[PDB]
Amino acid sequence: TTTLAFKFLHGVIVAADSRATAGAYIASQTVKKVIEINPYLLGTMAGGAADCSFWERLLARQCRIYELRNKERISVAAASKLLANMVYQYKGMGLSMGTMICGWDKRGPGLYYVDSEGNRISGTAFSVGSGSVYAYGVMDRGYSYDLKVEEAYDLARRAIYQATYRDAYSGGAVNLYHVREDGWIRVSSDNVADLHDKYSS
Amino acid sequence: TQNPMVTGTSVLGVKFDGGVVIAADMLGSYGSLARFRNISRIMRVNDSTMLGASGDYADFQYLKQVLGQMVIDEELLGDGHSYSPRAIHSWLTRAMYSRRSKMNPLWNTMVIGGYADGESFLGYVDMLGVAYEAPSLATGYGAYLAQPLLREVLEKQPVLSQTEARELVERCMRVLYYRDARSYNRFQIATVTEKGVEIEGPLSAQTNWDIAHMIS
Amino acid sequence: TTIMAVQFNGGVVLGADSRTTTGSYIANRVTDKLTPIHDHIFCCRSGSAADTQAVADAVTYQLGFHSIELNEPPLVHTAASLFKEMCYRYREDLMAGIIIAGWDPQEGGQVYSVPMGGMMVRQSFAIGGSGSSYIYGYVDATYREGMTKDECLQFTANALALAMERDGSSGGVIRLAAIQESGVERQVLLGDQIPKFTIATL
Amino acid sequence: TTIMAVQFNGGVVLGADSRTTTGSYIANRVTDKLTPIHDHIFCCRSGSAADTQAVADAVTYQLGFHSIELNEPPLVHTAASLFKEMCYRYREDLMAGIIIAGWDPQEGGQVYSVPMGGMMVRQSFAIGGSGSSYIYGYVDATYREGMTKDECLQFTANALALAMERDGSSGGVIRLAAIQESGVERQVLLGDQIPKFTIATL
Amino acid sequence: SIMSYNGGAVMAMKGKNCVAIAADRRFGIQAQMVTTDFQKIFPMGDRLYIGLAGLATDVQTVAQRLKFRLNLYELKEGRQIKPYTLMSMVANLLYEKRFGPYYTEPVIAGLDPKTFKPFICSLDLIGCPMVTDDFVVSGTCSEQMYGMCESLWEPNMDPEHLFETISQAMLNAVDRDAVSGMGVIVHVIEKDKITTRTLKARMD
Amino acid sequence: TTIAGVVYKDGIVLGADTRATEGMVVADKNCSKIHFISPNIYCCGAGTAADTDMTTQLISSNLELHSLTTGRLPRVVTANRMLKQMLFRYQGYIGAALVLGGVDVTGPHLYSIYPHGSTDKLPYVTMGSGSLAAMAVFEDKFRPDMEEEEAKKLVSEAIAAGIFNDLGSGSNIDLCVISKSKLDFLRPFSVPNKKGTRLGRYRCEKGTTAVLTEKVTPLE
Amino acid sequence: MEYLIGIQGPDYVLVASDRVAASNIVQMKDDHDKMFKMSEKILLLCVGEAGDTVQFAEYIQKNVQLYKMRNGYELSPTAAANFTRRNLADCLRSRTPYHVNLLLAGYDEHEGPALYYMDYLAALAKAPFAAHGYGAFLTLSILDRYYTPTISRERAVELLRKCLEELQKRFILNLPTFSVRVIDKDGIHNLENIAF
Amino acid sequence: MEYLIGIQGPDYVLVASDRVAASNIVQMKDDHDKMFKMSEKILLLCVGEAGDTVQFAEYIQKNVQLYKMRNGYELSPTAAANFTRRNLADCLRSRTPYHVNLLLAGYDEHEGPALYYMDYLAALAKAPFAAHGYGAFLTLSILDRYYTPTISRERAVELLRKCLEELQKRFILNLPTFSVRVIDKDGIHNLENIAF
Amino acid sequence: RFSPYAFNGGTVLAIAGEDFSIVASDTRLSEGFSIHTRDSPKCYKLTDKTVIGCSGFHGDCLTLTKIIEARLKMYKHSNNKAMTTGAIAAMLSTILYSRRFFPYYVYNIIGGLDEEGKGAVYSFDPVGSYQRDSFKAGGSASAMLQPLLDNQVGFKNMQNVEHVPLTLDRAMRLVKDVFISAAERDVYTGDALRICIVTKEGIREETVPLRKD
Ligand SMILES: *[C@@](C)(CO)[C@](*)(O)[C@H](Cc1ccccc1)NC(=O)[C@H](Cc1ccc(OC)cc1)NC(=O)[C@H](C)NC(=O)CN1CCOCC1
Ligand SMILES: *[C@@](C)(CO)[C@](*)(O)[C@H](Cc1ccccc1)NC(=O)[C@H](Cc1ccc(OC)cc1)NC(=O)[C@H](C)NC(=O)CN1CCOCC1
Ligand SMILES: *[C@@](C)(CO)[C@](*)(O)[C@H](Cc1ccccc1)NC(=O)[C@H](Cc1ccc(OC)cc1)NC(=O)[C@H](C)NC(=O)CN1CCOCC1
Ligand SMILES: *[C@@](C)(CO)[C@](*)(O)[C@H](Cc1ccccc1)NC(=O)[C@H](Cc1ccc(OC)cc1)NC(=O)[C@H](C)NC(=O)CN1CCOCC1
Structure with missing residues (x-):
């Protein structure tokens, strides 16, 4: 995998690839790695394929029950804390998942990194996955808090593309999400092969 | 069972026109030692189905006891329902897999033979819960020696008479005695038929040793 | 160990050596490996000293209560079945090679083998223990159908003496027990009494 | 394997089973384990097929040259010494259990044991191989001081027959060879010819 | 796996009176890509090529040690090497290191001098020759390449049809392997000419 | 592999399958496993494929060097000794399971030689992953001093048994018939297995691939 | 842990x-x-x-x-x-x-x-740009991003500076100073050591 | 890798x-x-x-x-x-x-x-000054050298600075910023984060 | 100690069309170097609209199938309706993840019709990770079947071919051809090919022989 998320003036950009591997073998190139928990809350997937899918779907169940009981949307902090506690009980057992929880809160834009190791940290920008080291480079060089909406899109789109270029376990297509105050929107699903054409010109 | 002790080698089975025939030698080997030269490794389950077991004999004695009771429990009710050969096969797959999943396997490989409602049944069961049906079956070294011969004949002639199937087994048991070092030239022949289940006493395969003189 | 039991007409003959080893040291050079379980039922113990002993003591307790409750002289098969259940259920924890031999008014003299796996089989004669390896050939060559009680005593004593001769983890003294309807009679062979098969080389 | 050699006044008798295994499968069910080194010297091979085969080939080469260089019929002891020198030197590399039995016009019938260690000892009779474990008791009880050639033939044939019955690594065909001043006579025991010992339980 | 360390894939295909040889262009260490233009197919005598797949060092060490021996051969003999002769030379070179081999499974494709007959073969890391009339493959996506070639390859193919087959067989196989790709180079060897083409491929 | 050998009335009939494996995949569908030793001696091979090829060549080379010096037809025992002692020297690190067959001035001889260097002189032998399946045929149908065509039938059926019952073996059956009078190397003796005829049309039409770089080099 | 980087121009x-x-x-x-x-x-x-x-x-x-x-x-x-x-x-x-x-x-x-890039296994490869060490993982993507074959030396230093600044931001190991040298027709030239 | 330091005054x-x-x-x-x-x-x-x-x-x-x-x-x-x-x-x-x-x-x-100082094994020990992590090895000696029981807080922050500068000089791991807090009679006070 | 797993080979394939779904598998069951049976089709029907194919450790495949069938009735009893293909696929994911730390050594492929009558295919890993795709291979020969399908059905890597909709005839020929190709190289694949076809009216079965070696 490569996944990334950064917050700025206009919201939170969420980006991911679509490759899934079983050893050296590419299992899929059309994996949706960004899961839609709520109309305003998102979660990225990196690591064990089933682990990320199961536990983040468990979270989606957890968040909905919370909404029904309390008549109010769950916070980004509370949604990240639940997953951090659920996955901590299985520490050292073999679970492998690195996720980002993005949403718009009562506190504003929210971004948390949650590990199967038991990490839970808030931050402005994260990159998670095997090709994360490559995405970190290009993201940090072209990053500004004052970035225009479309300029932040191309930054995230390029950062995943650059990762798929160096990482063997990253590829397929770059998917983009934009978290606004009134909820997230689905930006674009661009194939890496098509991006290679554009960025070469 | 983590470590098998007294074990039985190959068990054979082939279905014919009329029923099923199963063969197994009467040896319980303790490693390379042939300790128990006179033990029955074939059991009659009910009127329509029988069982031959490879591997750990103590584990076989357990399954013999459990199945033994199950058949008794059915015949108590007298409701006109009895376990079909396919049912016993199904049950045994469930039992063996259950123990495998508990990481405490019954160290066995079974061959189930039966005759019910016109068609004859032959089924295989691993110590892991691998089960399937086949016109001919062979466990242990039988798989490498007997089964090839059993398949070759069924290629030319799919349906066999009781006599043809019986003398084929004679030929298979002869090869096994030549080549398997854990076998014994004293076996039982078990047969399922419309009449029921018959197990026959001590049988020996006639051997040839002419190839001794032609070395030089 | 070496242990042995032979079935004759009116009962059984049991025989064992007397050596207990802790590595290469004989901890007990005169051991009674023939354990009484009931009036006419005995068992021969080989393998782990603590393991076989504990099983024996549990079967004695179990058969004791069973006999009183059933109001019959206990079946040898029943005593063998109590050994089987324990040796099979705890086969991964125990190291026990048992031979159960005895008499009952229903089936007469009986010899049952319970090896390390926990299987049970009736035999005309049975042998067990580490020393039994060296006497398979002799025992198969010597055994005859329908031996008298006095011949079975000689047969067990000969087989054991040969086994104690070769096996390091066997030796000491031959202990014999004869069980029939009339009861149990015991004898012990010392030094000269052990059948001498002279050292056979140049 | 089971291998065997017996000594009498005129010379020696040699016996071997015919089974060779690759694990549990029998590669050759009718092997000739008795390997001629010279006119009157044979060796019985047990253990690794390839190891014992190479040693035998090299000894035959060495003794062959030795006998021509001395212009004298080769001593059995000399042949056995050439086995000792190799088996001892390469003890960590070879899996060899050799019995060297023969006749020479100076000492007569001779049976030498060279076991896995590489030591050498002369014996009245010797047994070797995995199957030999099961016949020590029988061999200790049957052997008599001063057996004739015909008696030695039956003695070795019986012991092997008993070994092949119990040992999985043994079986097939009994191979016998008698060596004296006259020369070497070899015979083969097939199926029914093998001394019948009835399987007796209940 | 030692063979999976650098990845790579080499393929050869037989045509009418021609042979094609293709390889991926990635040079990477495990997950990281390093170079997008790595050479795996080497010329051995105008109308004869060798493609080496495996560990990147051994690919290069064998290629250079083979040329060392081939140049001495072509000078000693008054002739240029024959396809079968090269195959036996490579097998010889690889078997010399029987108990510590070069981790490379070579593929030879070329046309026989004078007789202009097509020739393809693949070898072991210890040099076992395997001649075929259809195709030979070697690399990390061995299975992927086999599936393509079996379903695509046809008996008699003209240079253009042969090129389309090897190209499509390489591209689609490589796209299911993580450690292979980043471009595919193809050599079509005819009696009168050699066509060398780099294909449009995915770069992920 | 499956390889087999038999001794008949006139000489020796050797058999082999044509499958070579890389891991659990078929590397060569048509492989030559019956090897030339001398004009009168041939040798089947199983185990490590490269070890089979090179061992059999080296001995074939040594025997030719031997026969040229003696000026007479080489013996099967010489081939056996050369193979046995070499394999033993390498302690089984050269994985060569071999069936050696030929006709001498002494007559017809058949051997099985193991990677460790142990030899068996027998009327019928099997080596390889499908050897037990092949042996089951030999133990069922073999009779002493068979006719040429009867022995050809027996060995081909033994190899077939290996082919169909062992995953390590497949494809064609190769035979080699050696007598005092004649040598017959029947490469494709039997083709029991065949690829199914293609139904779909997957012709990659000209210009279906996109090209970035093209260079054409002219030749002589 | 050590770091190497190379940028080739015209x-x-x-x-x-x-x-x-x-x-x-x-x-x-x-x-x-x-x-x-x-x-x-x-x-x-x-x-x-x-x-x-x-x-x-x-x-x-x-x-x-x-x-x-x-x-x-x-x-x-x-x-x-x-x-x-x-x-x-x-x-x-x-x-x-x-x-x-x-x-x-x-x-x-x-x-x-x-x-030229070279493995410890001795795999030689010619590249327009290459890097060694853990720091390579963070920088190589920046090289892929802002590189053309026609890059001038003064803008190549800027590109190099972008890489070294990333090692201060993300790389967990302390690497304050870097030796910088250029090779051309005149030979080997010492440059100002980039410090933080 | 992580670093902690505490200095007790009067x-x-x-x-x-x-x-x-x-x-x-x-x-x-x-x-x-x-x-x-x-x-x-x-x-x-x-x-x-x-x-x-x-x-x-x-x-x-x-x-x-x-x-x-x-x-x-x-x-x-x-x-x-x-x-x-x-x-x-x-x-x-x-x-x-x-x-x-x-x-x-x-x-x-x-x-x-x-x-209070506490091991992962749960050994409690009261001290005038303490440190955790690999940085402790390079800082405890400085703390041993310049510490007095009657150290003023202005001179304690000066002592803290000496230790943090040592981490910039000798310690292999890049630790640019540090949180600084004081606890006294009035409670917990936030100080300016020491940056390098 | 003791291995609770065995590799039994076998490959499953599924292709989704407009009004159909094809679930195909070879019929060989293996172990080590020998064949257990030549008659072991891996594709199995669950409802009128859904077919599953299991490969890997047969012990688990048998057990898992028996679990699914039970659960199908459990759903039927409680909700008074047949389980939809998507609901079966979603349930299987939870059944497979329940054994996360003692995995089913199993590769599942579900094929059938969705709620609008269109072809649907679902691919699974041993621990329950799944997605909907147009075509998938799973098993010992999945690496051989996939690249050809990606080329022919997915039209990938070809320059100028207008994406022609899949026909039942062309998909059936494609299925037969990839397995014939697989039987040439993979040792675990052969004997016979079983094909299940799911349409508006029940499920159909077709059988083509393969190499027996
Ligand atoms: C990139 C591609 C790096 O692998 C991503 O991390 C990707 C994330 C993803 C993919 C699909 C759906 C959601 C998110 N990860 C993978 O594709 C992953 C690689 C991996 C294998 C095993 C792991 O366990 C330690 C961790 C990561 N691939 C898979 O999970 C594949 C589909 N399944 C298996 O390998 C099955 N395993 C699960 C664990 O137990 C052994 C069998
Ligand atoms: C012969 C001598 C050896 O095989 C007999 O089997 C004999 C049986 C016997 C002994 C006393 C009373 C009745 C019957 N066996 C022993 O003497 C026995 C040898 C043995 C040791 C450990 C074993 O593994 C569980 C199995 C056999 N010796 C003992 O039991 C002695 C008294 N105890 C020890 O050796 C202590 N051991 C226990 C196991 O762990 C290592 C230390
Ligand atoms: C009986 C059968 C077994 O104990 C005999 O000792 C017999 C001796 C014999 C055989 C042929 C000709 C003359 C005499 N031994 C064997 O049959 C022998 C058993 C054995 C195998 C390996 C050993 O350690 C190196 C020791 C004994 N069988 C063989 O040598 C066979 C032909 N080869 C193999 O088993 C191959 N092995 C080599 C070791 O590693 C495992 C595979
Ligand atoms: C059958 C096919 C076994 O399945 C035969 O024994 C056959 C023998 C043969 C085939 C062609 C030409 C001459 C003789 N053996 C093989 O095909 C053999 C299988 C094998 C693989 C690895 C082994 O471990 C040492 C032993 C046997 N295949 C090969 O030799 C293949 C082509 N090479 C490799 O797998 C690479 N090996 C070489 C040995 O060292 C490990 C890597």
């Missing part, structure tokens, strides 16, 4: 390496040089094992110098890289394998600027 | 910790706060294994707060440290042991300033 080769020599948790040296002068126009940047680095790079260095004295002229960058690779490849299966990841940069009379 | 406790959250080779966070507020006068400086740090620290945190609500008054620095030690020492031989090295800093109304 007529120059820009190379840089950290000046940190560390032992377990301490920085023992502040001004360490990981660059070895082979010729007047060739540099060998050597990184890896504690003992192997100095021993290997120096052995090749004196051999190239021996070649200079032997024949009167210097080795080409291509010939130098192949000589280094041969000595590394030969030792790979021997009793003393050198665990060195190196980078060779040079300017040729007729061929121009050249940069 | 009427105050000065504590500092790095603001770096690291994943193998990358810095993920620039401003990671490693201090946990227990009471108005107690800080828990927690460091160690991935998930254990936050899980264990917050459990004590919420239990100390539970004690506040349940009784009205707060736990003393001594009472808090022993409570924390009991929870760690009881988990030591349990199914789930917490791998955390921590510093407890507090001010008492009677006994004044107190600094």
